[PDB]
Amino acid sequence: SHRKYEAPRHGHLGFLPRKRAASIRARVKAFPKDDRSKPVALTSFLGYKAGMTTIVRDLDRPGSKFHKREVVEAVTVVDTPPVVVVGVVGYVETPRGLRSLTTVWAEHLSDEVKRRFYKNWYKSKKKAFTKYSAKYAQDGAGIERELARIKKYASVVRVLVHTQIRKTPLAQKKAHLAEIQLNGGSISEKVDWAREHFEKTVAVDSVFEQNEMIDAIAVTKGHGFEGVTHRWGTKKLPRKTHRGLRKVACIGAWHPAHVMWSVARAGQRGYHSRTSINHKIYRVGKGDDEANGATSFDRTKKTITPMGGFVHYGEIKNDFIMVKGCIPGNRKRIVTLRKSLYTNTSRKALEEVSLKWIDTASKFGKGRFQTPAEKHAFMGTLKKDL
Amino acid sequence: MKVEVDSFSGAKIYPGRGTLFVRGDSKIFRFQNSKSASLFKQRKNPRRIAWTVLFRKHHKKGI
Amino acid sequence: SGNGAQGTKFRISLGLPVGAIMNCADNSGARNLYIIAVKGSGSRLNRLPAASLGDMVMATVKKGKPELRKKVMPAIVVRQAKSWRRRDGVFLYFEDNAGVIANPKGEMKGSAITGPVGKECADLWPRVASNSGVVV
RNA sequence: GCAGUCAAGCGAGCGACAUUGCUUUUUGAUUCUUCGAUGUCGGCUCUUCCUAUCAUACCGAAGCAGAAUUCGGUAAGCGUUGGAUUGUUCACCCACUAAUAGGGAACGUGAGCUGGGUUUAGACCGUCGUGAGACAGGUUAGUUUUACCCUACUGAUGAAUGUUACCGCAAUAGUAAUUGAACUUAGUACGAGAGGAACAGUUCAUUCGGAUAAUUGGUUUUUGCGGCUGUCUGAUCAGGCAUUGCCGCGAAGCUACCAUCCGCUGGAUUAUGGCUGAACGCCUCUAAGUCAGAAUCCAUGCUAGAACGCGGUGAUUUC
RNA sequence: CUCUUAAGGUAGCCAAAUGCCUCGUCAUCUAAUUAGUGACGCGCAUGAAUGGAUUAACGAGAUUCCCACUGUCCCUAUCUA
RNA sequence: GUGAACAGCCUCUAGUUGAUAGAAUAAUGUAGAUAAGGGAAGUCGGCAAAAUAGAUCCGUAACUUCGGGAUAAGGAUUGGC
């Protein structure tokens, strides 16, 4: 018979299977559409998540009750040192998909990028691109003939960039490597730009601007095998239930006589690949700038790092991108930022943001002070002072 | 923006921290953390708690 | 919400589900109000309707003057004990739940409110802000 | 239970006397399978399907205007509740809402729960019998067992492809957003007046979903700090035991519409409305052709990545 | 008035553990009550040691409401062995 | 020893240190807990858990077989020197 009282189902069928992701990097499925008119430029970037903080600003939203009023919002900072370009790959369009045609690497690759090709580095002979580097020789005929084919045949050109992990405080020494698509210019200009930038760095300020809207891709925080009640939000059974009450009661009918994929079942929760969208940038800071956390209305020389360092990360000493709210991922993880795939003309998209105060009270507890000089003024001399 | 003062302790409540309370007689009390908010709800006198501004002022500490 | 609403209300935490007794804050002769519904609620398979500060609820008078008892009559929530966040970052709460009687289009049955009144109820009801003494 | 045809009658629309059908959510008829046993009513919890459409969407019409109401068509994408009495199925009331539609899946669902009903043995009462005892009459108390096997579903590894390592393509499968209100248009169009809209634009909210933990709140074996009782170490100091002795606060972690953030835009078509135009010298959206078109469909986008689909690239062993 | 028996239910009591029709009708308790209580009684089929009506105290008996209290529930989360 | 107490808790004489162990800390369990706002809206049903609790002083209704109801109900105090 029919169910007595209706209700929506639990969970979303578009996010199946709920399994561990293949790689710790979430891969950028789609890149923005190209138009050949503009200059050459990257479409995505790589960074490392740091933590969160608080921001106070005015609201420029005509019509709303809080127009020209203060509002407190949350933000998340991403440690983004410059990326290093180390190769170019060309893709031809075939009736059964795209297809790479050639990869042309640079000559000298850093140690931290060629750690990505070894599992047991400490006992290796460090033989990696050793024969390839002898290709530049005295003339470089081999390399320049390979680039000739990319200009002749490829329809999509991409670039290989490895992040400079050594600068971030992570204990990891191996550097990530990922492909970023070049948009803008003829196919000829695209491959030339890559060649000039071999071994050169590309900073964050050359990709994103302050009020842009971007998309985040990253692998979510994992939790392991999880029951039905916290994997799909199913109702709990009454107290007087024999053989457990955090279980789904009916897992199907007599017929079809097979458990359906649509039923809620226990298993992996967390560690999926997600692509959130429409995050507004709030600041594009500079690493070698003191007063990274100051503003027009604050005016105190202090950096973005709270007191005691971001919990479980450390201190920020490079460029950074703080965005409105949450991005998928946990702290310390690789996060890849993408340019939006459509022109957003909403009021929210076009709104311009000028901050008024960035928080730096310790996140390791109920912080009370913003600067070590503020603590000394309020409290005065202590015994441990000279 | 404005920085407030905790009623029980006298600390500074930067935006988005603590809680606010409005009892029947319209009086407003601001607290910086749950530690102070609890010590208020236990009808406990600030001038006895050692780490507060009222206690230090009363005992003439920090001259 | 109601005919007398002056506009929109930003969400605040629900804290007075069906079955909650909340003081009467006016001089209409009632001592307390008893929520039996909330205007502007939705549906879910076991979700109880809950009212917040500014909502017009349908309510009965449990202890109060005889004429006002034994009949369903609207009300407006003027205080609540559940703590809610304003867009300016401040969590706050009153020390009691209260409300006042009203007709369908937001006119008070009485002529005086005793105690503080939330600014979100006053901004939404022109005929509650008139009789309010102190607004927080 | 549902639906047609006739057209006397009533008044765009209803419909008698007759009469042709459909469904298997009613109850009968029959006794084909099961009596060396297929666990029986209802409720709870959960997935999916049908359409005989309550709501939303798109069209048509009524009545000499609005507004509201009513009727008819395409339509299963999405939704369809909180409760008082009752074991209920059904039913009736109060209340909100866009609305509170009808059904199937061994009258779905008892090695998933519960045991209020029925349906053993104890007990009472009314009527019935001389009696033992009878009664789809009322009342009260009454043991709810087993998974480690195969498959199915949810997750997790994995030999073999020279070896090993990094970066990718994308067949196939899945998919998602939903509904209301207020400001402006505007006291305008319309109408004698009373009254009273709509497209473009803006601010919020209901229902669902995916994450995240700056802040707020929950939790405490941080047994971190303090406090208190009894007793034991001769006293103080510092400690033992009281199944974590009790009390206040309590960072980290986990977590809550109890907190916060995010939830895309293009094409093709259905009903319908047109262009040109015959059949049928006129006529006609149609027969050839062709323009616009929606909660519809397909792409964009989002999840997996065939462990027997594929490509690029690095290094390939001096006793 | 009349048929009829051995005699034709008296004092009491009731939709009660005894009433089919039945969710009887009226009032009270609720926003709403097939529930509870107080009333009415041609009572299918109440009633006198088949004991009738009432009754303070008592009851791991059956039923209804109120105050207090609470994770039963809204709506779940966390800790220990 | 504490206390009204061969209650519960700690100890002296005497007696045992016996019950397969090592390692991590998933889901579901058994046993023990705590929860903001509401307070029975859950359920056939307050089933389960919670709240009350010792002692001293004050105050204690209807009904009653005059013995009871009664710890009714409702309040206040409690350490150390």
C23 occurs within a structural domain: yes
Write out chain A residues lying below 8 Å of C7, CB-based.
65
Overall CATH class of domain A16-81+203-220+270-384:
mainly beta
A121 CA, D205 C1': Å apart? 58
Cα separation, A131 vs A139, in Å, equals 16
What are the residue boundaries of the structural domains of chain A, listed by start?
Answer: 16-81+203-220+270-384, 82-202
The count of structural domains within chain C is 1
Rounded distance in angstroms from the CA atom of residue C39 to the C1' atom of nucleotide D12: 40
* C-alpha closest to that of B28 among C95, C78, C87: C95
Instruction: Supply the CATH number for residue C95's domain.
Output: 2.40.150.20
In a domain, C3, yes or no: no
CB contact under 8 A, C87 and A72: yes
User: Which residues, 6 or more positions from A179, have their beta carbon under 8 angstroms from its beta carbon?
Assistant: A89, A158, A159, A160, A161
Q: Which nucleotide is nearest to C61 (CA to C1')?
A: E31
Q: Max Cα separation, chain B?
A: 38
Nearest-CA neighbor of C101 among C66, C60, C63?
C60
Solved using: cryo-EM
Q: Which of A6, A54, A66 sits opposite C87 (nearest CB)?
A: A66
Instruction: Collect all residues with Cβ–Cβ distance below 8 Å to C2 and sequence separation of at least 6.
Output: C39, C56, C104, C105, C106
In angstroms, the separation between the Cα of residue A236 and the nearest Cα of chain C is 12
CB of residue A236 closer than 7 A to nucleic acid strand E?
A: yes
Q: At what angle do helices A141-153 and A187-196 cross, to 10 degrees?
A: 150
Residue among C83, C91, C95 whose CB faces B23 most closely: C95
Sign of CA pseudo-dihedral C37, C43, C47, C52 = negative
Cβ–Cβ below 8 Å for B22 and C116:
yes
Does the beta-carbon distance from C89 to A6 stay under 8 Å? no
Closest approach of B35 to chain C, Cα-based (Å): 16
Tell me, yes or no, whether C60 lies in a domain: yes
Residues C94 and C80: beta-carbon distance below 8 Å:
yes
Resolution in A: 3.0
As given in the structure block, the two tokens for residue A385 are: 């002072």
Q: Which of A368, A374, A376, A379 to mutate to test the interface with B (most CBs of B within 10 A)?
A: A368
> Angle at Cα C18 formed by Cα C17 and Cα C19, nearest 5°?
110
Separation of CA C6 and C1' D11 in angstroms?
Answer: 48
> Which residues 217-236 of A have a C-beta within 8 angstroms of C?
235
**Rounded distance between C-alpha atoms, residue A356 and residue A293, angstroms:** 10
Indicate whether C7 belongs to any domain.
Answer: no
Architecture of domain A82-202 in this structure: 2-Layer Sandwich (3.30)
Using an 8 Å CB-CB cutoff, list chain B residues near A375.
Answer: none
Question: Distance between CA A279 and CA A337 in Å, rounded?
Answer: 10
| CB of B54 closer than 8 Å to CB of B10 | yes
Q: Which domain does C28 fall in, by range?
A: 15-136
Helix, strand counts (H, E) of chain B: 2, 4
Residue C4 lies in a domain: no
Contact B37/A at CB under 8 A = no
Instruction: Give all strands (DSSP E) within chain A, no chain letters.
Output: 41-42, 44-58, 70-79, 83-94, 97-105, 156-163, 177-183, 201-202, 213-219, 224-226, 267-269, 273-285, 320-324, 334-339, 355-358
Radius of gyration of chain A (CA): 26
